[PDB]
Design a protein around this ligand. Sequence first.
Ligand SMILES: [Mn+2]
Ligand SMILES: [Mn+2]
Length: 269
Amino acid sequence: ATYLIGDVHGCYDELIALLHKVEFTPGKDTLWLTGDLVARGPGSLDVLRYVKSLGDSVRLVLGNHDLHLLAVFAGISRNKPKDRLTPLLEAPDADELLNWLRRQPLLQIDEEKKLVMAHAGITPQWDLQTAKECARDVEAVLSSDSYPFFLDAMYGDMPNNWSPELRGLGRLRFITNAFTRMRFCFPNGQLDMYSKESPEEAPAPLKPWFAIPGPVAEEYSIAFGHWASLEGKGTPEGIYALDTGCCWGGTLTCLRWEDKQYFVQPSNR
Ligand SMILES: [Mn+2]
Ligand SMILES: [Mn+2]
């Protein structure tokens, strides 16, 4: 069976309880994870150890908090006490875990399921071929020996409009924002990088990225996490918002793909 789970955020106990509820069995089942495995919850170290141990039975995409952890580890960014990353950063296997993490994809595609996953979704300004190329470019910098330079360049809120003519730092920053920070778009599809509210609370003319018809969403289902204020509700058919805010005292959500059945684990916080 195929299971998709939203942002874990170090909530290891809830993740394990949810997987026991569906009797997840590596080798018979596959788990898809929307990213943001780490930070806020207490068990980021255990989460990374477990997910890494899954090998081919897990399909991960990296989120913005996974990339922030990599930036802290590389000395690029400052550790925020509320993220609770210190046990992971100080672990004797930290290098092994984080060098594995930086090699993971930003985008997962399954053609037989017609299913696409990324942390924040797929910007309506991209077709599938462009999304694939952009993911490959950023994954290449992340998996290279020079990844701290990329991580440093990645911070920024501009440019917020895609063009195939984008080059260099701006191209990389847009790609990273689109895959890992996107929520709202302007009507032309341009990213807004400030509003984190629910769609009902947003100021006009902002609309959710999934309310703007895009070529990927017309041919594929899209699963994503990231947007906790959405509470997993209000999406069109074929759009699956899996982040129900476990680290925030909400819930951890698992979707079984074969029958679209939902399973929920309440937060222990
Ligand atoms: Mn998150
Ligand atoms: Mn996120």
